[PDB]
Amino acid sequence: ANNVLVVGGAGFIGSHTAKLLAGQGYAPVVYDNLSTGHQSAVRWGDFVEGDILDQARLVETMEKYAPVAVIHFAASAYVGESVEDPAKYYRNNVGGTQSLLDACRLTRTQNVIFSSSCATYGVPSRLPIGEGEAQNPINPYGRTKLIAEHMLADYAVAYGLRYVALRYFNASGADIDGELGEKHDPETHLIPRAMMAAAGRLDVLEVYGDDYETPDGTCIRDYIHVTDLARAHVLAVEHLKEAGGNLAVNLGTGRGTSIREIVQSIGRLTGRSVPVAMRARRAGDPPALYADPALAAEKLGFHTVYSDLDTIIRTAAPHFGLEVR
Ligand SMILES: NC(=O)c1ccc[n+]([C@@H]2O[C@H](COP(=O)([O-])OP(=O)(O)OC[C@H]3O[C@@H](n4cnc5c(N)ncnc54)[C@H](O)[C@@H]3O)[C@@H](O)[C@H]2O)c1
Numbered sequence: 001a002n003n004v005l006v007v008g009g010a011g012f013i014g015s016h017t018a019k020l021l022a023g024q025g026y027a028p029v030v031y032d033n034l035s036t037g038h039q040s041a042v043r044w045g046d047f048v049e050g051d052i053l054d055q056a057r058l059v060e061t062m063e064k065y066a067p068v069a070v071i072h073f074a075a076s077a078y079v080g081e082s083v084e085d086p087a088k089y090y091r092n093n094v095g096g097t098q099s100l101l102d103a104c105r106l107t108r109t110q111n112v113i114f115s116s117s118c119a120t121y122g123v124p125s126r127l128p129i130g131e132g133e134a135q136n137p138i139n140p141y142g143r144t145k146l147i148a149e150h151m152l153a154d155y156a157v158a159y160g161l162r163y164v165a166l167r168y169f170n171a172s173g174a175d176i177d178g179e180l181g182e183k184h185d186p187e188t189h190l191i192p193r194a195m196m197a198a199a200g201r202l203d204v205l206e207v208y209g210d211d212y213e214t215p216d217g218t219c220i221r222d223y224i225h226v227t228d229l230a231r232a233h234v235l236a237v238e239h240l241k242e243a244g245g246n247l248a249v250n251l252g253t254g255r256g257t258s259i260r261e262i263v264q265s266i267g268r269l270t271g272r273s274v275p276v277a278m279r280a281r282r283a284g285d286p287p288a289l290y291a292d293p294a295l296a297a298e299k300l301g302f303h304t305v306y307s308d309l310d311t312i313i314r315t316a317a318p319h320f321g322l323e324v325r
Pocket residue numbers: 007008009010011012013014031032033034035036037038050051052053072073074075076077092096115116117118168169170171172
């Protein structure tokens with residue numbers, strides 16, 4: 001009917017996507033083990049506490065709700081944690097995804113929207129990064145996201161599963177209306193850390209390098225507003241509903257953002273400066289990484305509409321002890 005199973009739906013991007021689904025008349029059903037997400041963020045439909053590795057419980061859930069699509073956000077997502085603890089990432093991201101895909105095929109639950117990462121590309125050859133770019137990830141996090149992408153392809157071949165894999169770099173901002181935000185502990189993402197530091201919730205923001213080959217010398221990365229991510233994941237649902245073919249596309253603005261720009265923007269919009277501690281650049285670290293969004297525009301009709309820096313900063317700031325002036 002209109003149930004959409006949002007796996008990992010108690011987390012940052014998943015909860016925003018559940019909110020959006022409900023706005024478009026779907027009934028999001030959240031399946032989440034609350035390991036890093038929050039029960040209080042499940043505000044737009046039913047909640048099933050459970051682990052995606054609990055295959056009986058996941059199958060039971062799919063049988064009860066007969067979802068028209070499954071959106072898979074349920075993963076371990078931290079790069080540095082993945083180098084030191086690869087076990088966690090192979091278990092959650094490869095084992096967990098296989099359990100989810102088995103639950104899907106065994107219940108004839110057909111449409112899977114997979115939240116992937118541009119970390120699958122590793123170091124690229126040209127900028128911006130097109131989907132044709134080789135995928136040579138350089139850490140277990142990127143590795144395990146790539147494995148899930150290929151597992152999706154193999155399950156499509158064998159079982160006729162239909163899917164859209166969505167690749168992006170950095171989820172940012174928060175819901176425009178202010179009641180839903182990014183709550184991680186530890187918080188490892190750049191814009192939240194910079195804001196926490198400006199707010200005095202962190203003492204410093206260590207920034208590694210001011211001598212990159214970039215306009216202001218600080219490194220450039222790719223940021224997309226979480227509401228835009230919600231929009232794309234639901235468009236992906238529509239795509240498969242309308243008998244669309246399997247897809248793997250990048251999500252983003254097509255334009256990068258430097259650390260300096262972010263720090264400057266925060267100081268300007270909140271009146272509080274970020275206490276930056278500039279450290280030596282790490283050798284072999286890329287000056288710029290950002291994705292080519294053209295294919296998503298073509299295949300999904302998707303453009304970002306909330307991912308200007310000012311909107312990202314303005315909507316996130318109130319969640320980290322700052323005020324927009
Ligand atoms: N945040 C980003 O910048 C970013 C970038 C690229 C990709 N992604 C992908 O987005 C998805 C979630 O991102 P988030 O940033 O919202 O992280 P998040 O941790 O806020 O949400 C993750 C959710 O998954 C749940 N979960 C984790 N393992 C589970 C399991 N085994 N069984 C059931 N529930 C489980 C957690 O409790 C949490 O609610 C992940 O797939 C992540 O790789 C995020």
